Amino acid sequence: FGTNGFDIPTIAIALLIVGVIIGLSGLILSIFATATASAISNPSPGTLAYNLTHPLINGMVSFFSFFPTLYVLLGVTGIVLIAAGIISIIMEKF
Amino acid sequence: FGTNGFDIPTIAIALLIVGVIIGLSGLILSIFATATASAISNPSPGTLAYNLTHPLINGMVSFFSFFPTLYVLLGVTGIVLIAAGIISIIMEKF
Amino acid sequence: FGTNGFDIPTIAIALLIVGVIIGLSGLILSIFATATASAISNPSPGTLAYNLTHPLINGMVSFFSFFPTLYVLLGVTGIVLIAAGIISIIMEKF
Amino acid sequence: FGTNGFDIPTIAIALLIVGVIIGLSGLILSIFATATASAISNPSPGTLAYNLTHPLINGMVSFFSFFPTLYVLLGVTGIVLIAAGIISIIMEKF
Amino acid sequence: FGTNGFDIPTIAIALLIVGVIIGLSGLILSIFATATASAISNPSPGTLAYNLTHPLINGMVSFFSFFPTLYVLLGVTGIVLIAAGIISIIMEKF
Amino acid sequence: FGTNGFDIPTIAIALLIVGVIIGLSGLILSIFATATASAISNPSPGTLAYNLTHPLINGMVSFFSFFPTLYVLLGVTGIVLIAAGIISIIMEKF
Amino acid sequence: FGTNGFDIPTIAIALLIVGVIIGLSGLILSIFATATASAISNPSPGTLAYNLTHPLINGMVSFFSFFPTLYVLLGVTGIVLIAAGIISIIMEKF
């Protein structure tokens, strides 16, 4: 069901795969992050261990705050792909 | 699901891998830094051992303060990669 | 996840390795310096042993004071590397 | 019941084995630790035997406090394995 | 009764096997866990044996709390397999 | 239950072995140290035997104070090993 | 009545043998322990014979307290064996 490489069943299967992979990723990352939160403690506000450890958790927080826009762009990509498929169909179907 | 090398499932798997590696790194570094903090003591403010040891902990603090911006740039890189993928799709999909 | 040699997982692993090595180095050097401080005594301010020993501890102090800037430059190097990676990606990704 | 190496009965048997081994380990370690606690006495707070023995029990306590996160990560591994199996099934089942 | 490798009797037999194995596993693990609970005692809240033994039972509890989601994913896998079978039948049966 | 050399049952057995060996070591060392403490006496603060014997017990105390950090690092090693196993699974399971 | 080595009559005979041996063991041990209790006397709480004899009876009590869990595990083993037999039958009977 297509012209050259645009196959609606294939597109649906691809959506299946990407959705499942994203759900799995969220699951694994949350489960691991819970363990991370449990492991690290809060020594004191101003002792040696605080100076030693604080920037690491800061970087953790920053990167995990960067994730959302990555996910948003990844979502946007599919609309572009489907759109290109529609246009390619229209171009030479007539 | 792509054109030449841009594969959304592959991108999601890459995000999985990088997130997990970063979480693991933070965990290991914090656990080790706790041991470091426990090991080193505070001899005295002005004796020989203080002169011998203070610059080392200063360098420790400095490098660990350098980590956050490294993490931030590492996070920024992915947006650039996804963006280049979107543009490459758009260029020859039509 | 990259173009030619820039791999974000590899970068994260490299950061793991360098951070751990630096922590280990600080630990070992501090532990050894404590033993050094314990071993050497203070004979007298003006006897033969003082003339014999003082410049050595002076050199010790000087070199250990040189360490911090070495560590700072070592930290700076990584930002340059990540930056070059970003630029290299941008150059031919489009 | 699978495609290449993913067999749900085999997975269930593996879960059987790991659960039983972990239960056995906890049992043996607790039984032995009771004997350890019974054997060692408390000589005095400041005599020779205290200096001789205290760091050993400190190391005991530390290592046994390290066990929990090891167990948690060991538990996390199975979700990753099952997840990879699901994805591998989905990839070429269609 | 199938096309290439999808056999409804074989699927039913596989469901038989997995269900029986899971029931057996639950039975054995519960019976063994009862013995574990009977064996270990509660020495005191703060003595040596408590420090020696508490993290082990903590790890026990954690891993056994991890089991449920493993079972849930294992259950989910079968729907995917049956679904892939249905789609494969539909693809070339017509 | 693994890919190449990472076997969760094998890991659990290894944890069994290391925990038991560490418990045994603590037991034997404490029992022997009690005998050492009983054997050596305190002659006098300033006689010949004191000069002859004091540094030996000082070295005893020092080494036994060094033990704890050794144990801590030994504990840290296992988290690294399990982490490497998880990453290796993730790398080529997908 | 079986497939390869699983014979229900043989299993029943094995249960016969193990039950009878366990009953005999309990009988003999109790009869002998009565004689032991009769033989040893209670000299005094603090004389030489008390110091000479008390730890022996302590070890007696400890070992005999260890027996119950041994018996429990021995009982658990049979359920595992019968379970493995059932699974082996199911595997290739169909």
Side-chain angles (χ1 to χ4, degrees):
Chain A
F1 201 48
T3 171
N4 53 0
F6 198 57
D7 181 73
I8 296 91
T10 309
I11 301 300
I13 297 166
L15 264 68
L16 187 76
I17 300 167
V18 292
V20 104
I21 291 175
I22 297 169
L24 272 96
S25 50
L27 176 63
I28 297 169
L29 268 298
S30 54
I31 290 173
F32 198 107
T34 303
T36 72
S38 47
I40 292 93
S41 57
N42 296 114
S44 158
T47 57
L48 190 56
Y50 179 68
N51 294 333
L52 269 285
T53 60
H54 196 67
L56 300 165
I57 81 171
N58 282 332
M60 301 327 284
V61 166
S62 48
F63 200 98
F64 292 146
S65 357
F66 284 108
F67 273 103
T69 176
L70 299 159
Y71 277 162
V72 173
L73 272 296
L74 195 61
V76 176
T77 313
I79 300 164
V80 189
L81 279 170
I82 294 172
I86 289 175
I87 284 169
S88 45
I89 278 176
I90 293 170
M91 214 77 93
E92 68 272 13
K93 269 322 182 203
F94 313 94
Chain B
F1 201 48
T3 171
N4 53 0
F6 198 57
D7 181 73
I8 296 91
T10 309
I11 301 300
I13 297 166
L15 264 68
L16 187 76
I17 300 167
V18 292
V20 104
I21 291 175
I22 297 169
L24 272 96
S25 50
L27 176 63
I28 297 169
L29 268 298
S30 54
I31 290 173
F32 198 107
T34 303
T36 72
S38 47
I40 292 93
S41 57
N42 296 114
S44 158
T47 57
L48 190 56
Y50 179 68
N51 294 333
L52 269 285
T53 60
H54 196 67
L56 300 165
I57 81 171
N58 282 332
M60 301 327 284
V61 166
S62 48
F63 200 98
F64 292 146
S65 357
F66 284 108
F67 273 103
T69 176
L70 299 159
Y71 277 162
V72 173
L73 272 296
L74 195 61
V76 176
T77 313
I79 300 164
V80 189
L81 279 170
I82 294 172
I86 289 175
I87 284 169
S88 45
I89 278 177
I90 293 170
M91 214 77 93
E92 68 272 13
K93 269 322 182 203
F94 313 94
Chain C
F1 201 48
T3 171
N4 53 0
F6 198 57
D7 181 73
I8 296 91
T10 309
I11 301 300
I13 297 166
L15 264 68
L16 187 76
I17 300 167
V18 292
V20 104
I21 291 175
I22 297 169
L24 272 96
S25 50
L27 176 63
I28 297 169
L29 268 298
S30 54
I31 290 173
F32 198 107
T34 303
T36 72
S38 47
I40 292 93
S41 57
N42 296 114
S44 158
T47 57
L48 190 56
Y50 179 68
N51 294 333
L52 269 285
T53 60
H54 196 67
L56 300 165
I57 81 171
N58 282 332
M60 301 327 284
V61 166
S62 48
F63 200 98
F64 292 146
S65 357
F66 284 108
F67 273 103
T69 176
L70 299 159
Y71 277 162
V72 173
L73 272 296
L74 195 61
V76 176
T77 313
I79 300 164
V80 189
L81 279 170
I82 294 172
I86 289 175
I87 284 169
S88 45
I89 278 177
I90 293 170
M91 214 77 93
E92 68 272 13
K93 269 322 182 203
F94 313 94
Chain D
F1 201 48
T3 171
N4 53 0
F6 198 57
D7 181 73
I8 296 91
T10 309
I11 301 300
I13 297 166
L15 264 68
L16 187 76
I17 300 167
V18 292
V20 104
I21 291 175
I22 297 169
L24 272 96
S25 50
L27 176 63
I28 297 169
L29 268 298
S30 54
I31 290 173
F32 198 107
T34 303
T36 72
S38 47
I40 292 93
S41 57
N42 296 114
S44 158
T47 57
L48 190 56
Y50 179 68
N51 294 333
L52 269 285
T53 60
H54 196 67
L56 300 165
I57 81 171
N58 282 332
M60 301 327 284
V61 166
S62 48
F63 200 98
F64 292 146
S65 357
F66 284 108
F67 273 103
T69 176
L70 299 159
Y71 277 162
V72 173
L73 272 296
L74 195 61
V76 176
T77 313
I79 300 164
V80 189
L81 279 170
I82 294 172
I86 289 175
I87 284 169
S88 45
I89 278 176
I90 293 170
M91 214 77 93
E92 68 272 13
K93 269 322 182 203
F94 313 94
Chain E
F1 201 48
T3 171
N4 53 0
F6 198 57
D7 181 73
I8 296 91
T10 309
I11 301 300
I13 297 166
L15 264 68
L16 187 76
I17 300 167
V18 292
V20 104
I21 291 175
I22 297 169
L24 272 96
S25 50
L27 176 63
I28 297 169
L29 268 298
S30 54
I31 290 173
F32 198 107
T34 303
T36 72
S38 47
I40 292 93
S41 57
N42 296 114
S44 158
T47 57
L48 190 56
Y50 179 68
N51 294 333
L52 269 285
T53 60
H54 196 67
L56 300 165
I57 81 171
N58 282 332
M60 301 327 284
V61 166
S62 48
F63 200 98
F64 292 146
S65 357
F66 284 108
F67 273 103
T69 176
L70 299 159
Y71 277 162
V72 173
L73 272 296
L74 195 61
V76 176
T77 313
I79 300 164
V80 189
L81 279 170
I82 294 172
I86 289 175
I87 284 169
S88 45
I89 278 176
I90 293 170
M91 214 77 93
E92 68 272 13
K93 269 322 182 203
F94 313 94
Chain F
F1 201 48
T3 171
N4 53 0
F6 198 57
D7 181 73
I8 296 91
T10 309
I11 301 300
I13 297 166
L15 264 68
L16 187 76
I17 300 167
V18 292
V20 104
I21 291 175
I22 297 169
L24 272 96
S25 50
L27 176 63
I28 297 169
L29 268 298
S30 54
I31 290 173
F32 198 107
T34 303
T36 72
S38 47
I40 292 93
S41 57
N42 296 114
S44 158
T47 57
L48 190 56
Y50 179 68
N51 294 333
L52 269 285
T53 60
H54 196 67
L56 300 165
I57 81 171
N58 282 332
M60 301 327 284
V61 166
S62 48
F63 200 98
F64 292 146
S65 357
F66 284 108
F67 273 103
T69 176
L70 299 159
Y71 277 162
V72 173
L73 272 296
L74 195 61
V76 176
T77 313
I79 300 164
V80 189
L81 279 170
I82 294 172
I86 289 175
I87 284 169
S88 45
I89 278 176
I90 293 170
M91 214 77 93
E92 68 272 13
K93 269 322 182 203
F94 313 94
Chain G
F1 201 48
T3 171
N4 53 0
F6 198 57
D7 181 73
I8 296 91
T10 309
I11 301 300
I13 297 166
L15 264 68
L16 187 76
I17 300 167
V18 292
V20 104
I21 291 175
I22 297 169
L24 272 96
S25 50
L27 176 63
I28 297 169
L29 268 298
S30 54
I31 290 173
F32 198 107
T34 303
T36 72
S38 47
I40 292 93
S41 57
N42 296 114
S44 158
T47 57
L48 190 56
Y50 179 68
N51 294 333
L52 269 285
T53 60
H54 196 67
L56 300 165
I57 81 171
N58 282 332
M60 301 327 284
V61 166
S62 48
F63 200 98
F64 292 146
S65 357
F66 284 108
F67 273 103
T69 176
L70 299 159
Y71 277 162
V72 173
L73 272 296
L74 195 61
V76 176
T77 313
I79 300 164
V80 189
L81 279 170
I82 294 172
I86 289 175
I87 284 169
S88 45
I89 278 176
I90 293 170
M91 214 77 93
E92 68 272 13
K93 269 322 182 203
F94 313 94

